[PDB]
Write a protein that binds this ligand. Structure first.
Ligand SMILES: Cc1cc2nc3c(=O)[nH]c(=O)nc-3n(C[C@H](O)[C@H](O)[C@H](O)COP(=O)(O)O)c2cc1C
Ligand code: SF4
Ligand code: SF4
Ligand code: SF4
Ligand code: SF4
Ligand code: SF4
Ligand code: FES
Ligand code: FES
Ligand SMILES: [Ca+2]
Lengths: 156, 142, 907, 148
């Protein structure tokens, strides 16, 4: 039973002013809805489409293409660990193994209570500063397996 | 005494699970030089292609075996049995109930649907040979 | 224009073309997937790779894509270069890694472009040992099945559906090797042109669901060149038959009319041929008992009673051929021949004919529509009636982006560059209807109004274009502002198109459209006009003429007509059912010659088993005025020996000879056409539409069956093991066999099906064209009956008064549906679910005055009858009007423009 | 900068009116490709475009467009403020100006240092990055990221 809220709708129409076409606001509109609800539900695809004046198959095409826009329910805190080449040399596999022991899940899966979802991600742009991970909008560098339980405790 | 490769009576065989092996692909009918095979495709509610009718005119048949080698399911095979004879030429026309035997014949183990991507009962998507599980476009993993 | 060097040889090609369409026109086989002649080049599949050198002395060059490379003067390319051949084989190898082992149970098998290109590259050995990716499927409705595992990601489906056809509910999802083509969720594909996806997709992802019920391979099909019978556009089709039943409908390329695309009503509305209720033998009534007669008995029996009658009248049909109506006209005489359509429908059709023949404005062909710069659509809901014109109008609206790109020196085939330059800029399109149309997404302005108000806007545009045109007093300033917008776009256009039609049910709308075209013709514009008619041979029956059906019913109930020969007509659509059933009961002898089972054959005294278009030959005249020949697909007597299905012209000619001299005459088709030409000068062009039955390709007859047709000694072996003789065709140049000619370079215009060595798919049509995407090599079939007149007409001064609602009386606003409004195709079982529920559409203010809402069953009265329908709510419908679905079971199309005296809630 | 008059309309009294925007991405590497950046900016799936035409003529919304890296744009104030002659004579090499060069991996001092062109890789590895960590030998190096 999806409805666009009156503040999400005003935020989408705020960014339609900054482009020639309202089609250009589609990425930000998906991120606006996901920021409020954790993920983009199925009824939000038709909701965003009718506001922007583009077909729903165009909105769904964009949302499935982009990795960060989520079309499946996630946890309260998303853990995104780097698995690219410089983090592979600095020991990401030990970080991945420590994350799979504290959480008792596999990447792509959420925890049973729904607190955390574990996802691999590309290079975060922090390659010189060691193995890297992100929890929500927070970047943690110089990762060690011993640091994994204390770091996770902050996010409840 | 007949060798195993003897080209006598034409039968249709069955799967080791017990279903008819013919998927009504019509390759045997077109590869026959004499034009002695007629068949029509039917489809179950499960989605399995099977022949609605299968008709071989044995008066015209020359027992060349081009139908057997055309078949991509091993359903149609030529058996060592030459014992045929009739008073009427109309009784040389064999229907599917005169051709479908109880087992797999010369090739005991081959099942075509295990290879095929198409989904029928007992084999959903990703349950075929050398086939991975379907990944949805909405999946969180990149 | 340009000269290129290919593999050492030298050729002359068009410079504007790219290298793939240049080399395919010369007969050089290059494999390809993502390119289409209609859709343009995008460069995705990388299959069309050739090696390009800088000059004649450069020995080591580079691999380019021939669909993306211009054929400039001085080009040096090598198709057969070893590095190019290895790469082209690798592209097929990469596509074969994830392809399922599905060819025996794939409906595309034997007609698969991927199968042809795999063999053509010469890749036959698998090296890949890993797992294959799989996809789940969607439900896409009753017409198209979905199997995403077979997809090769060529992007042809989305480029056709969104870019070309302007559909909104198909897209591409995902990324990398997990790309998914389909809908966002399951459900019916909403586009009226969805069914072209089965030809457009080079694999078996999108396949015909109506053909997969009774599937057969392409080599087992019997094909004939035929014409679509579902509306007046005249799309060329190639129907295929196996075991005495029509199996699928294929597009038959015609570079003048339809080219690569059909509509969904044409493609999927063929199921009425395959009904078990059709009459197969002549049937004569004896009180309550029914007697079955053979052809000789039926003719002698009918002409005994017809000799004793004092006056015989004949009722023709718009869905009957020109040879069938003329034979009926020859049997009763031209003074006793009636057209079978109502007087008001007759009046709109002859006025539509008058402006085409005498207006002095050229009427464009269906592909010529795509070159026009402005389109005004007056009254014709063209997507629901004449659907291929709406597809052609969408391409005309995209001409603005092609003009901008040409100024920036972007090539015509580089479609993604042209679309990027465009950015929603459109040629102006102005449509008028009673409600919203499916052209509203691309229309510059939509005008929802009653039909007199649509005509009054049409006369005011003509008066604002020319001072001599009559004026419309009483126009408000709000409408006056919009009229100036339309007039500045029309007068500023270099090539405007005016579209109207008879389906609006108003004489004044057709009169308003001729005034706009006349006012633009006086300004110096190269103006075209298009009128859409109702049925396949509406224009042909109008050229022949005759009295209206209402006059015929008068001659029955006033005693003067002793007998009536109804030809392929269900009279309920054209006139009141109670009047028809009463007037056919007073007649001593009623004879019906129809291929379909109709309600008026219950009390009929003699029924003749007429043939449908699949089992008949004849000429139909489309909305443009082009006479086109359709050929018989199959002999229905071959499988069932009791079947006495003859052509309508063959039944009526034989009856006339038995009436004169007591001897039956089963005539030939060319003798009937010759008889038409002598008596009717206006139908003289039909002789040249197709050659006669003595036409040969070096002594060979044109083949109906592919050369690898199977089962000759087993098809009929369950009835008799003795093979029967092959059916002999004396009417046409075609043979009911595979022993004939279907060469791509044969000097002919009528091509039954396309097949070439190494090209088993619909891509084999490239071998039959002069240039790919052009015309057929020796000319497209069909001839225009009339040329543009030297002088035009006068201005029509019959301006209607403004529409006013009345208390009690409700005007009936016509609503048309592609899957319900046509007589034959609504009897197809696959159309029963695609058609909507019967409804009644009301303005919100009028439903508030009536006290009803959406879903309430409401009762009304037409002609003393009572029909109850559930209410639907229409905001764009103006008050005083009532929306009805035309041409359904119960709602005749004669009801358009009628009045409903009483309307109240059902109890 | 919008309240000091360095952005918006009538910047520094001249007729020039420029309005700057920041729009964050949704996470695909192909969005860094310049024609696919234009499609991502337009709100489409980030496919690249075929060249020709170039974005200088037909770019974002079919308008003339220029796409430049962040570090390319940051060199431009140095050139205009100091002069064309200063920038040419920074290094005596065929590549002009300074570059952000660095070493990452299991090295003693991973980091980033602004250096002119023509600096050798060994100088970056052994003087700036401090060489390999103790107990590690040098096997191979990629000069410019993952695509090299
Ligand atoms: C796959 C791919 C990814 C790219 N990613 C980036 C990128 O992240 N940042 C960037 O500045 N250029 C990237 N580029 C290069 C751009 O396409 C383009 O050449 C560059 O932005 C031009 O700007 P410049 O002249 O300042 O270097 C990428 C190119 C490719 C082919
Ligand atoms: S017998 Fe074999 S070749 Fe013939 S239709 Fe059946 S599966 Fe196809
Ligand atoms: S053995 Fe030869 S002739 Fe007999 S059915 Fe098979 S292919 Fe036809
Ligand atoms: S799409 Fe073509 S290649 Fe693929 S299974 Fe069907 S027939 Fe075979
Ligand atoms: S569904 Fe068919 S047309 Fe569309 S991309 Fe896949 S293979 Fe091409
Ligand atoms: S537009 Fe008319 S003639 Fe053409 S395919 Fe559709 S119904 Fe048939
Ligand atoms: S490779 Fe890990 S952040 Fe760059
Ligand atoms: S056909 Fe040319 S790249 Fe696809
Ligand atoms: Ca005939």
């Amino acid at each position: 039973a999806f409805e666009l809220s009156a503040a999400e709708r005003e935020a989408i129409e705020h960014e339609m002013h900054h482009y020639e076409d309202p089609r250009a606001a589609s990425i930000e509109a998906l991120k606006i809805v996901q920021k409020q609800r954790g993920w983009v539900p199925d009824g939000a695809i038709h909701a965003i489409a009718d506001v922007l004046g583009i077909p729903a198959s165009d909105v769904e095409g964009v949302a499935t293409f982009y990795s960060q826009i989520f079309r499946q329910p996630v946890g309260r805190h998303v853990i995104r660990y780097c698995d690219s080449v410089v983090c592979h040399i600095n020991g990401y596999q030990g970080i991945q193994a420590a994350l799979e022991k504290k959480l008792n899940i596999k990447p792509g899966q959420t925890t049973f209570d729904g607190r955390f979802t574990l996802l691999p991600t590309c290079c975060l742009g922090n390659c010189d500063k060691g193995p890297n991970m992100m929890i929500d909008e927070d970047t943690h560098a110089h990762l060690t397996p011993e640091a994994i339980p204390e770091l996770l405790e902050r996010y409840k | 005494y007949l060798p195993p490769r003897y080209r006598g009576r034409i039968v249709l065989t069955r799967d080791p699970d017990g279903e008819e092996r013919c998927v009504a692909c019509n390759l045997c009918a077109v590869a026959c030089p004499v034009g002695c095979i007629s068949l029509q495709k039917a489809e179950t509610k499960d989605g399995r292609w099977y022949p609605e009718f299968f008709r071989i005119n044995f008066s015209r048949c020359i027992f060349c075996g081009l139908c057997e080698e055309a078949c991509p399911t091993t359903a149609i095979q030529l058996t060592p049995d030459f014992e045929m004879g009739e008073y009427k030429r109309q009784d040389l026309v064999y229907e599917k109930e005169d051709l479908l035997i109880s087992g797999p014949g010369k090739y005991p183990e081959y099942n075509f649907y295990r290879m095929a991507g198409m989904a029928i009962d007992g084999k959903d998507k990703g349950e075929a040979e050398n086939e991975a599980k379907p990944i949805d476009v909405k999946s969180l993993l990149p | 224009m340009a000269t290129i060097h290919v593999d050492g040889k030298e050729y002359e090609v068009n410079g504007a073309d790219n290298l793939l369409e240049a080399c395919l026109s010369l007969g050089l086989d290059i494999p390809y997937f993502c390119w289409h002649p209609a859709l343009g080049s995008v460069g995705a599949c990388r299959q069309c790779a050739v090696k390009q050198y800088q000059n004649a002395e450069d020995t080591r060059g580079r691999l380019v894509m021939s669909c993306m490379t211009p054929a400039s003067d001085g080009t040096f390319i090598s198709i057969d270069d070893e590095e190019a051949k290895q790469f082209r084989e690798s592209v097929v190898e990469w596509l074969m890694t994830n392809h399922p082992h599905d060819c025996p149970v794939c409906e595309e098998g034997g007609n698969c472009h991927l199968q042809d290109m795999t063999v053509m590259t010469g890749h036959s050995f698998r090296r890949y040992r890993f797992t294959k990716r799989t996809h789940r499927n969607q439900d896409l409705g009753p017409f198209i099945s979905h199997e995403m595992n077979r997809c090769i990601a060529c992007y042809r489906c989305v480029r056709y559906y969104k870019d070309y056809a302007d559909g909104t509910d198909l897209g591409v999802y995902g990324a990398h090797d997990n790309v998914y083509f389909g809908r966002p969720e399951d459900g019916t594909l909403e586009s009226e042109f969805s069914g072209n996806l089965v030809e457009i997709c080079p694999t078996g992802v999108f396949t015909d669901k109506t053909h997969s019920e009774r599937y057969n391979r392409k080599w087992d099909m019997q094909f004939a060149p035929s014409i679509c019978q579902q509306c007046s556009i005249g799309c060329n089709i190639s129907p295929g038959e196996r075991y005495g039943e029509l199996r699928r409908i294929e597009n038959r390329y015609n570079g003048t009319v339809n080219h690569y695309f059909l509509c969904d009503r044409g493609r999927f509305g063929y199921g009425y041929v395959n009904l078990k209720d059709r009459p197969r033998q002549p049937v004569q009534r004896r009180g309550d008992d029914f007697i079955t007669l053979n052809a000789e008995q039926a003719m002698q029996g009918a002409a005994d009673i017809l000799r004793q009658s004092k006056k015989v009248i004949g009722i023709g049909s718009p869905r009957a051929s020109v040879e069938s109506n003329f034979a009926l006209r020859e049997l009763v005489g031209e003074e006793n021949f009636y057209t079978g359509i109502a007087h008001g429908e007759q009046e709109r059709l002859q006025l539509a004919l008058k402006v085409l023949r005498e207006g002095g404005i050229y009427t464009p062909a269906l592909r010529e529509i795509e070159s026009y710069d402005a389109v005004l659509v007056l009254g014709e809901d063209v997507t629901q009636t004449g659907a291929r014109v709406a597809l052609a109008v969408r391409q005309a609206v995209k001409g603005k982006a092609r003009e901008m790109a040409a100024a920036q020196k972007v090539a015509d085939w580089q479609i993604a560059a042209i679309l990027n330059i465009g950015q929603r800029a459109k040629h102006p399109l102005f449509v008028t209807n009673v409600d919203d149309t499916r052209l509203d997404d691309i229309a510059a302005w939509t005008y929802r109004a009653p039909v007199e108000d649509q005509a009054r806007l049409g006369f005011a545009i003509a008066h604002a274009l020319d001072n001599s045109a009559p004026a419309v007093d009483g126009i408000e300033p709000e409408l006056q502002s919009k009229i100036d917008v339309i007039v500045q776009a029309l007068a500023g256009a270099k090539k405007p198109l005016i579209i109207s039609g008879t389906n609006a049910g108003s004489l004044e709308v057709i009169q308003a459209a001729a005034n706009v075209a006349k006012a633009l013709k006086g300004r110096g514009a190269d103006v075209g006009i298009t009128m859409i008619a109702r049925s396949v041979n509406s224009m042909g029956l109008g050229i022949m003429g005759g009295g209206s059906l209402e006059e015929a019913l008068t001659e029955l109930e006033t005693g003067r007509a002793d007998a009536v020969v109804v030809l392929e007509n269900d009279l309920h659509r054209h006139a009141s059912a109670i009047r028809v059933n009463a007037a056919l009961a007073k007649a001593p002898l009623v004879m019906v010659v129809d291929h379909q089972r109709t309600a008026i054959m219950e009390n009929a005294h003699l029924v003749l088993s007429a043939a449908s278009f699949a089992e008949s030959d004849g000429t139909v005249i489309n909305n443009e005025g082009r006479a086109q020949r359709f050929f018989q697909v199959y002999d229905p007597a071959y499988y069932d020996s009791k079947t006495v299905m003859l052509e309508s012209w063959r039944w009526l000619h034989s009856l006339h000879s038995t009436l004169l001299s007591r001897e039956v005459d089963w005539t030939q088709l060319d003798h009937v056409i010759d008889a038409v030409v002598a008596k009717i000068p206006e139908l003289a062009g039909i002789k040249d539409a197709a050659p006669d039955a003595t036409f040969r390709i070096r002594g060979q007859k044109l083949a109906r069956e592919p050369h690898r047709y199977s089962g000759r000694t087993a098809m009929r072996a369950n009835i008799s093991v003795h093979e029967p003789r092959q059916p002999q065709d004396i009417d046409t140049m075609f043979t009911f066999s595979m022993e004939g000619n279907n060469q791509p370079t044969a000097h002919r215009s009528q091509v039954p099906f396309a097949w070439a060595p190494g090209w088993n798919s619909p891509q084999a049509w490239n071998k039959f064209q002069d240039e790919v995407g052009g015309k057929l090599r020796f000319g497209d079939p069909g001839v225009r009956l009339f040329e543009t007149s030297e002088n035009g007409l006068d201005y029509f001064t019959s301006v209607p008064a403004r529409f006013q609602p009345q208390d009690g009386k409700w005007r009936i606003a016509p609503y048309y549906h592609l899957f319900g409004s046509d007589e034959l195709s609504q009897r197809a079982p696959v159309f029963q679910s695609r058609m909507p529920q019967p409804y009644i559409k009301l303005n919100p203010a009028d439903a508030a005055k009536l006290g009803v809402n959406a879903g309430t069953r409401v009762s009304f009265s037409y002609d003393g009858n009572t029909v109850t329908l559930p209410v639907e709510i229409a905001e764009g419908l103006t008050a005083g009007q009532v929306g009805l679905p035309m041409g359904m079971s119960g709602i005749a199309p004669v009801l358009a423009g009628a009045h409903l005296e009483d309307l109240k809630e059902a109890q | 900068a919008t309240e000091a008059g360095l952005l918006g309309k009538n910047i520094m009294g001249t007729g020039f009116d420029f309005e700057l925007f920041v729009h964050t991405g949704a996470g695909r590497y192909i969005c860094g490709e310049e024609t696919a950046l234009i499609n991502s900016l337009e709100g489409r799936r980030a496919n690249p475009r075929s060249k020709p035409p170039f974005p200088a003529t037909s770019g974002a919304w079919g308008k003339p467009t220029c796409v430049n890296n962040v570090e390319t744009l940051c060199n431009v104030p140095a050139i205009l403020a100091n002069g064309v002659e200063w920038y040419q004579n920074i290094s005596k090499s065929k590549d002009a100006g300074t570059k952000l060069m660095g070493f990452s991996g299991r090295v003693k001092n991973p980091g980033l240092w602004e250096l002119p062109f023509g600096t050798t890789a060994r100088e970056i590895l052994e003087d700036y990055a401090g060489g390999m960590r103790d107990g590690l030998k040098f096997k191979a190096w990629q000069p410019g990221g993952a695509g090299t």
